[PDB]
Ligand binder design. Structure first.
Ligand code: NAP
Ligand code: NAP
Ligand code: NAP
Ligand code: NAP
Ligand code: 6KT
Ligand code: 6KT
Ligand code: 6KT
Ligand code: 6KT
Lengths: 250, 250, 250, 250
């Protein structure tokens, strides 16, 4: 029987590449998505064409609210429903936008989105994963630039720091159950869609190793390692995949 | 005129010692409290006996909710209404209790309390402090053991990691306004009074420097340094006040 | 055709496991040794029996001295002479013993061995490797307990901290040359042969992940990942392989 | 009776500022120097004119060699000879120059100077200070940019990382003796004398807090705090004094 993985925010970009690589490794996959229904369904079709009954989609908003625990329980439940097991959780989904401290969304909505997607949903997904329970593990998508943050991104940065805390606390608490918990911390990978070309090139030029952003596949490679049998003694570790970017001074 | 400071969770323990030392240094103080009204008022009365019209109290729940931004705006406003200025914000208030990942508050109440008091309220207070604006600074009460956490304290640890992120992000963003943002990270300080001495001693014996916990006054001393003229180039720094505890392996 | 790797201290324990695994992956190997000639030659015999002329030995003392730069140049040169190329350098050799601050070898001998083997030899080897130059990389064997050090191990700890600095500095400086530089940080792996069984078990019980030390092969697996095509965007990263030990408070 | 302090590299710049501020606080001081004899004697003369018999000079090369332990023992002995006690050691002296990995002094001379002054001399001074033994403490001058290093400064950066390790290891080991060990980590403070103004301004513009380097007095203020009674529970802490520089991404 093939193991099964949940990947959040898996319709596009890094999450898609993670879901593809897990599937290529032998996993059955739950493709979680929020708005990107067409892309999620299209990915599941492509994976199922390769091996039937190995991919399903699961829609959920990961914004914090009093129903977020139920949504997170449902995502894990969807994996058990489709595949009878859940071996791997990848917390990839993320909201990312500025929240300046000095002055259409209310600040409480920004808190719910940025802290919910980046930290609270990973926590609740981790609880549900552990409670519903080989080679079990969780991989959190962190941020290599967490200590040299983007100006005016305080709530985003707070959420990603909270995710480091979750990675460490859950590694400690879940180790006696044989569940490893680790992180992968990109520097600059696939650049935002809204961003212009001259700006993208500015960021590319900062990266010591090759003066280019990471491909989604390069990020997924670190995820694959961490869920593999080659990482069985690794827990609580966060692997930077940043081309040296976090080493570069102002 | 005398400068003014807001101290959250100032009725008892570390926040009380901070408020007293700031007052002794010459600050007028807003004593924020949640449940401890008698203690808050007793402190205000003691400080006003020392110097008239130098202390007020401000009640607020710092749990996350739709009204938290308004509450935090009101806390800052209370300092301006009482004293005509707000020079110092000390984010001291904190909820602290276990939240195990594996199995009478709901998990979302625990999120609201632990992430709200430890991280979101500091963020909203920081926004309101900056918007309302010399030696201006913010001091956040962090935790020296954030990377070697208590078992089953994931939400607490997430909140304290988020607070490190806020300290760094806000230092960067507020530096152009001349507002410094720093942290003080206790190891073991005041223990619960109801905790058996035999249990308190297990903690005390872990501390390399003197085999004792920090007094509240020793924590307050680092706060006083950070708000002083002797720290005018210090921003984004977190000072451990832990007797070497964080250096001790398992 | 086949790439080539230098592994220092490769005759026994972790270095041996690294050498075996690199060989199994298709590398030709230089097995460096200081005192363990018999063991080095026995390993080379084993590897050459598998694939002829794919393993050579190289003697050198890695103690700091006037001749250490020449010795390090020779180690790198041996790889180029045997195999025509040098793709991977693994700085694994180490000295480990206490150096109490409050009171055999003179203290300056301890400096030469602890700082020399653990930090200066890696620096000189890195220089020689880079000067003599595809998937090129260096892997430094670090220590996951670097910030929670063993009592009375100051010089050892200083050396391992220096090695973190070299990993980061060399990653930055060598990135333009396409040379990646990373670390693997064991917690408790193969215990010193001198250490008694009760002391071994005492350390084992502290590890969250299965209450056991890492095998040498688990350490080697992380090295294999970092030198692989799956790590081509990773530079300046140190992967802990410690079963969660560094997360455990006193 | 007045307490006494040793400051290494105290003839000029930050070391002079530390010596002056310690003297103004009421310490008797040993002004260590290497080449700057006129400047050292001039400073001691100024201090002795303020309060007679409160300053002496002590010449020593802190480059690593087989006599460095005796030199470090002598610096400490000079404080006992002059003043009958030694309460504070400030490890300020430092060599700083590039050591490129890819191509006057031999590499072994560069190792001896950069690792000797920045790490081994602090280690040997720490040993002699502890063995010769109230409010006793050691303060090490570290570097806030240790994890975002200057290009081609590997040996310097290895030495400052080793000094972090010493700070932590010595804090742990000397805590039972009541000796606190801490660090102060400048970002950019007094720019090199040989640096032209245009290059100085490039660095100044990077600093979030005021777009200027730290004054020597600002660095000394943090040293004064760490030696004071207001830091009596602080050990193993490194206080950044960097105006937010280390938080600024590439
Ligand atoms: N890209 C980089 O350079 C970079 C750098 C550092 C860290 N990272 C981290 O790596 C991960 C992947 O990066 P990425 O650039 O691929 O991410 P992304 O494109 O910004 O976001 C990934 C997905 O997150 C989902 N998402 C957003 N808000 C959500 C909500 N309220 N509920 C549920 N899902 C939501 C979206 O799903 P739908 O499209 O279905 O709505 C989105 O496609 C993220 O955790 C990110 O923080 C990336
Ligand atoms: N004590 C230690 O050993 C230690 C160790 C590490 C870190 N720290 C940090 O140092 C700081 C002070 O420690 P402490 O031991 O003095 O803290 P504490 O006694 O646990 O709590 C301080 C105050 O926080 C306020 N608070 C709690 N929940 C609140 C809510 N929902 N809304 C508003 N206020 C709330 C309470 O005020 P009322 O009483 O008025 O309700 C309480 O008296 C905290 O940030 C803590 O995390 C302490
Ligand atoms: N084992 C662990 O639990 C652990 C934990 C943390 C970090 N590490 C790190 O992982 C790496 C490997 O650990 P290990 O336990 O396998 O190491 P080890 O057995 O202590 O030493 C490995 C080899 O280093 C060589 N070596 C020592 N001093 C030398 C000198 N002056 N000149 C030349 N070579 C010298 C020796 O080679 P010869 O026998 O040929 O003389 C020795 O066999 C080390 O860097 C270590 O610091 C290990
Ligand atoms: N300046 C900055 O921006 C900055 C930034 C980060 C860290 N720091 C750290 O802060 C401390 C003070 O900085 P600084 O700029 O004032 O230092 P500095 O001027 O570069 O050096 C201070 C003194 O070190 C002594 N020294 C150098 N080589 C020596 C040797 N072989 N033996 C004995 N003494 C030697 C010299 O004494 P003589 O003149 O008597 O020969 C020199 O005056 C240093 O530890 C430095 O690394 C400074
Ligand atoms: N461009 C970046 O550095 C960056 C950082 C974080 C991040 N998180 C996302 N969800 S997209 C994204 C982009
Ligand atoms: N005993 C401790 O180490 C500890 C840590 C954090 C904390 N936060 C509070 N609000 S009380 C408290 C106690
Ligand atoms: N017992 C350990 O945890 C340990 C730590 C470091 C180390 N370095 C060596 N060369 S052997 C060794 C063992
Ligand atoms: N320019 C700097 O940031 C800088 C850094 C370190 C340092 N160390 C010295 N001895 S002078 C000096 C200057």
């Amino acid at each position: 029987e093939a193991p099964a993985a949940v990947v959040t925010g898996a319709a596009k970009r890094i999450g898609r590449a993670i879901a593809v690589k897990l599937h290529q490794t032998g996993y059955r996959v739950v493709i979680h998505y929020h708005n990107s229904a067409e892309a999620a369904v299209s990915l599941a079709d492509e994976l199922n064409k390769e091996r039937s009954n190995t991919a399903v989609v699961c829609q959920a908003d990961l914004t914090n609210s009093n129903v977020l625990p139920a949504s997170c329980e449902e995502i894990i439940n969807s994996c058990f429903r489709a595949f009878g097991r859940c071996d791997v959780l990848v917390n990839n989904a993320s909201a990312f936008y500025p929240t300046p401290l000095v002055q259409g969304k209310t600040v409480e909505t920004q808190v719910a989105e940025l802290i919910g997607t980046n930290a609270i949903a990973p926590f609740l997904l981790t609880m549900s994963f552990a409670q519903r329970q080989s080679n079990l593990s969780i991989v959190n998508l962190c941020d290599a630039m967490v200590d040299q943050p983007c100006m005016a991104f305080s709530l985003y940065n707070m959420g990603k720091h909270a995710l480091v805390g979750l990675t460490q606390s859950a590694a400690l608490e879940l180790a006696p159950y044989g569940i490893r918990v680790n992180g992968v911390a990109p520097g600059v990978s696939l650049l935002p869609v809204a961003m212009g070309e001259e700006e993208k090139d500015k960021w590319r030029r900062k990266v010591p190793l090759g003066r280019r952003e990471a491909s989604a596949e390069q990020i997924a490679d670190a995820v694959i390692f961490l869920v593999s049998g080659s990482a069985q003694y690794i827990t609580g570790s966060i692997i930077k995949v940043d081309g040296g970017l976090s080493l570069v001074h102002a």
